[PDB]
């Protein structure tokens, strides 16, 4: 779930970047460093909206590299356990369902799915229906789910869904 | 221990600012509009494109004034910040569905008091 | 409300000259016209004579406070 | 480079004293 | 196809096919191709029949790129063309140059002809040079620190029309001044003697002159003789107007009108 918080970071700037475009160069380096990455503390970062201020560059002793502890106002996406969101189904397989929560892909197994939703391997598009064939769930459909677990695979978040609670399907 | 169902989060995340699907959608759209201009600039990555096409399929309302109105009519209540995002994004039909999906609403408020809010949210949708 | 001396001590002058020379050695822009010289240290010395070093000194006080003094603002000793 | 900034120079004005009388030519119209 | 693994179907006419010329039988250069095809370049590919074999058109020992106009992989032929052609007032000019050599093509154009050329100090920089006077040229080194944005890099038809054209017109306005002179580029040693030599002919009337320096383009010299002591006062020509005594005038005549009512003070 997306949020807007204030973060901090420092980047070393090589002395070749000194000049009238110092602040512009610092901003450009900041943009291509903290966009799209992920951390286990704050979660996955989408992008940066604006920068608060530029700190005082403390030149290191014996080294021309100077660090700028910049504080930027960026957004972050850190889903937690128990949250309910609305995602889209990407692929339907007998092992389980595949979805895509923005910068995440979760996964629901057949055990989580109730017994009413059977398999349709005979039909060309992998789909799940009921006995009466009234409700149909397939790919490219806005299907909800519940985040019952979380995981970070070395700055690569991958949660797990569930389909036990009622009112989880077509709106 | 981290479970949003029981309204618990780390200290850093407790002081965060909630965002709605339409809000993040328009923020990313404006960022794309700014970045596409000013040639000789590093183009967007696949993360930006996937987030855009993910948030564009759940934009209940395009007008920014709709976002302002729906946040203003909701902040007047005594619900926490976490209850401002999920309830305004999912837009459930009846109060029973909202209470079932979010266990925090069970016993926190009356039935008609939440049904009227859900009806207002549904009407605010474009 | 700065109370430290308005003169540049020899230690600060030496350190600023060394740091500026190190920066020029690492391909940094100069702030003064070169008359046909190449050694970074002499470049820094000419720069200090011309009062154009983009460095400001932070003199820490015993209490904990500090004062930011700019090379082009205080008087140079040598 | 051998082509420095030329418009960035600060034009220094010279000072002096000349206690003279008012006997010069008049002004003109801007039209 | 079974052995070489490269049939003529893959190679089409017009597409550039590299023909590595390794040897010559009689006149041409018959070598091997990239796909193991015997590329025989005839005398037509090099334009040499009863003369020395084609070495400049076809690289001997190495691979020479040429237009492929023949599919003869199975027949041990390679119709690769050795020739490069076979493979296939206010006049703003352009230049896709150094500084010393560029001066050789500036004295021919008249005043107002602006030329844009790259810079010679860093990267992603440009220098705009506009005709000022006879021998005087202002080299505006745009990073004359003219601050601009990056979107202007795509279209350069407005920077000279927003900062050079009015400035060039204002500078040219002073060229046609009644009391104008050059004095060999306006040297400081030659412009001082004239002031003392012209006062003797008319001690009462104190005339004035205007000239532009050569070592520092863009700084005119407006001198006068309040008494038997010379004095010099520079003036800058901004894009919007002039900069005299710190004030900026909208029109050229404004500076002249304001100057004739302030020089009477004792200073």
Swiss-Prot record, chain E:
Residues 27-83 form the S1 motif domain. Residues 89-179 form the SH2 domain. Coiled coil: none annotated. The modification Phosphotyrosine is found at residue 263. It is found in: Nucleus. Ubiquitously expressed. Interacts with RNA polymerase II and the DRB sensitivity-inducing factor complex (DSIF complex), which is composed of SUPT5H and SUPT4H1. Interacts with KDM6A. Interacts (via SH2 domain) with SETD1A. Interacts (via SH2 domain) with POLR2A phosphorylated at 'Ser-2'. Interacts with IWS1, AICDA and PAAF1. Interacts with histone H2B and H3. Interacts with WDR43. Histone H3-H4 chaperone that plays a key role in the regulation of transcription elongation and mRNA processing. Enhances the transcription elongation by RNA polymerase II (RNAPII) and is also required for the efficient activation of transcriptional elongation by the HIV-1 nuclear transcriptional activator, Tat. Besides chaperoning histones in transcription, acts to transport and splice mRNA by forming a complex with IWS1 and the C-terminal domain (CTD) of the RNAPII subunit RPB1 (POLR2A). Belongs to the SPT6 family. This is Transcription elongation factor SPT6. The lineage of its organism: Eukaryota, Metazoa, Chordata, Craniata, Vertebrata. The chain holds residues 1151 to 1519 of 1726 of the full protein.
């Amino acid at each position: 779930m997306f949020y807007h918080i204030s973060l901090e970071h420092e980047i070393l700037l090589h002395p070749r970047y000194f000049g009238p475009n110092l602040l512009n160069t610092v901003k450009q380096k900041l943009f291509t460093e903290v966009e799209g990455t992920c951390t286990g503390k704050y979660g996955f970062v989408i992008a940066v909206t604006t920068i608060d201020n530029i700190g005082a560059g403390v030149i290191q002793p014996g080294r021309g590299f100077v660090l700028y502890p910049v504080k930027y106002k960026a957004i972050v996406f850190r889903p937690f356990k128990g949250e309910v969101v609305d995602a889209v189904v990407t692929q339907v397989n007998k092992v389980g369902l595949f979805t895509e929560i923005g910068p995440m892909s979760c996964f629901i197994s057949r055990h989580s799915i109730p017994s009413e939703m059977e398999f349709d391997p005979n039909s060309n598009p992998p789909c799940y229906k009921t006995m009466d064939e009234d409700i149909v769930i397939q790919q490219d459909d806005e299907i909800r789910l519940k985040i019952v677990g979380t995981r970070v695979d070395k700055n690569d978040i991958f949660a797990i869904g569930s389909l036990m609670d009622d009112y989880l399907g077509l709106v | 221990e981290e479970d949003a169902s029981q309204l618990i989060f780390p200290k850093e995340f407790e002081t965060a600012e909630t965002l709605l699907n339409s809000e993040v959608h328009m923020l990313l759209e404006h960022r794309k509009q700014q970045n596409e201009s000013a040639e000789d600039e590093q183009e967007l990555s696949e993360v930006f494109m996937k987030t855009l096409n993910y948030t564009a399929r759940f934009s209940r309302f395009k007008n920014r004034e709709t976002i302002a109105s729906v946040r203003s009519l909701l902040l007047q209540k005594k619900l926490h910040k976490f209850e401002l995002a999920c309830l305004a994004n999912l837009c459930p039909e009846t109060a029973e569905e909202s209470k079932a999906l979010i266990p925090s609403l069970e016993g926190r408020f009356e039935d008609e008091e939440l049904q009227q809010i859900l009806d207002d949210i549904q009407t605010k949708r474009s | 409300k700065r109370i430290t001396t308005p003169y540049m001590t020899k230690y600060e002058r030496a350190r600023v000259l060394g740091t500026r020379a190190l920066q020029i050695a690492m391909c940094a822009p100069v702030m003064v016209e070169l008359e046909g010289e190449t050694d970074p240290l002499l470049i820094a010395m000419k720069e200090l004579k011309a009062r154009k070093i983009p460095i400001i000194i932070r003199r820490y006080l015993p209490d904990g406070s500090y004062e930011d003094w700019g090379v082009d603002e205080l008087i140079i000793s040598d | 480079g051998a082509t420095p900034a030329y418009g960035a120079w600060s034009p220094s004005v010279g000072s002096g004293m000349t206690p003279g009388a008012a006997g010069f030519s008049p002004s003109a119209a801007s039209d | 196809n079974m052995l070489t693994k490269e049939t003529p179907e893959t190679f089409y006419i017009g597409k550039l096919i590299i023909c590595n010329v390794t040897g010559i039988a009689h006149i041409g250069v018959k070598t091997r191709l990239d796909n193991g095809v015997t590329g025989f370049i005839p005398t037509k590919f090099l334009s040499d029949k009863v003369v020395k074999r084609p070495e400049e058109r076809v690289k001997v020992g190495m691979t020479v790129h040429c237009r492929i106009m023949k599919i003869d992989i199975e027949k041990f032929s390679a119709d690769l063309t050795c020739r490069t052609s076979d493979l296939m007032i206010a006049h703003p000019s352009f230049h896709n140059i150094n500084f010393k050599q560029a001066e050789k093509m500036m004295e021919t154009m008249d005043q107002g002809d602006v030329i844009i050329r790259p810079s010679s100090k860093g990267e992603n920089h440009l220098t705009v040079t506009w005709k000022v006077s006879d021998g005087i040229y202002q080299h505006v080194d745009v990073r004359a620190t003219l601050w601009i944005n990056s979107e202007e890099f795509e279209d350069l038809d407005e920077i000279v029309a927003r900062y050079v054209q009015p400035m060039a017109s204002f500078a040219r306005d002073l060229l046609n001044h009644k009391y104008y002179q050059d004095c060999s580029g306006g040297d400081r040693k030659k412009l001082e003697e004239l002031l003392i030599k012209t006062k003797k002919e008319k001690p009462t009337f104190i005339p004035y002159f205007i000239c532009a320096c050569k070592e520092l383009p863009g700084k005119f010299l407006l001198g006068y003789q309040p008494r038997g002591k010379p004095r010099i006062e520079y003036v800058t020509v901004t894009p919007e107007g002039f900069r005299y005594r710190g004030q900026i005038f909208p029109t050229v005549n404004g500076l002249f009108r304001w100057f004739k009512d302030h020089y009477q003070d004792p200073v």
